[PDB]
Nucleic acid binder design. Structure first.
Lengths: 203, 196
DNA sequence: ATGAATCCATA
DNA sequence: TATGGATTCAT
């Protein structure tokens, strides 16, 4: 596949190029190695596209998974305890799971265990590949990548998305690069706090 | 139903209390007037129905004048052009983007309840919906100058545990916001956690 | 009886 | 026509 657009948020791309140059080389290689044609096997049942053979998100997801795990990218999970008290939250935000619980419960407040898990993490870099609803991209950017960043698990996050040129060749209602880039820029300079590299791809 | 927790983000609640006091009174009244018992369902988990709770609020809100709204905007691949057209109106964004020789893509956000420049998102859905509501939907109306403060109604954990799996809860979403750091997102908000 | 995948009711 | 959320579909 082709890398059409790349956006470096908080200079996350430069950080990788300086500290983890092999990671950037590897990500580009993985994308270039994906044969989008072999993933064009989803026969649409939508009335507005009845019969068209579209790119399959399932096939695309499998293709990336195969290449990433083959390069040593592995699943990672980060745990943390949440609570209703804003102050206790700010206090335990950067502490270890065990201490977060201890601190919250020590104040007589209920500690609720939660977490975030992602399939592709390597050398303190997390990659998310998304071919689905708009809401999941917001969740990835402002919650998942952030959770791993705050818990000191990754230094930069990466989000791979289909350009509009590709999303229009998939089932309707799928998030695309241009739209998600806009959602991030709309936040204003410096938000979110986690450095990121947004990548828009096409066949 | 009852309000268990309230979080004023960027003093959004105070903003409403000063400029639109009738809105805060109305929001409280509506929550109190909803009977969670009439929103129960016969289904087991590994209960209260999200659809029923949603319809309950929808009825009350629309009866009080809350109506759906939509904000349009043109997106594009060039970051510089985005920052230049963020605050402009739809047709003007298109104009500016296409004049720079770039492709302009029509998009928008739509929400069910808006009134007196306030948006209320009732949310009894899957885990990714609140993040989208806060960082995308509310921000879109705020940046397009359609609302001054956003409101998010969510179930407390004690209610979500009595609902189908995967439903986000107040304590967790509050955490997601505060984890961003002070002042983020940029739109003033009032997060409200409820229980039966 | 969940999480995805994916269809489609409106503005 | 694109989004938001409804509905359908593999576990």
């Amino acid at each position: 596949m082709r890398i059409v657009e790349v956006y470096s948020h908080l200079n996350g791309l430069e950080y990788i190029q300086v500290h983890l140059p092999h990671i950037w080389e590897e990500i580009q290689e993985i994308i270039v190695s994906i044969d989008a044609e072999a993933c064009r096997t989803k026969e649409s049942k939508e009335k507005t596209k009845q019969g068209q053979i579209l790119y399959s998100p399932v096939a695309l997801n499998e293709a990336f998974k195969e290449k990433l795990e083959a390069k040593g990218w592995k699943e990672s999970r980060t745990n943390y305890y949440v609570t209703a008290d804003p102050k206790l939250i700010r206090e335990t935000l950067s502490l270890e799971p065990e201490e977060q619980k201890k601190v919250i419960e020590a104040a007589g407040k209920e500690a609720l265990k939660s977490y975030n898990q992602t399939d592709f993490v390597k050398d303190r870099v997390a990659i998310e590949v998304q071919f689905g609803k708009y809401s999941f991209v917001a969740y990835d950017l402002f919650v998942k990548h952030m959770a791993f960043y705050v818990s000191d698990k990754i230094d930069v996050g990466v989000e791979i998305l289909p350009m509009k040129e590709l999303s229009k060749e998939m089932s309707s209602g799928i998030s695309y690069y241009e739209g998600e880039l806009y959602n991030v820029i709309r936040q204003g300079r410096g938000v979110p706090a986690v450095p990121l590299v947004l990548i828009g791809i096409a066949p």
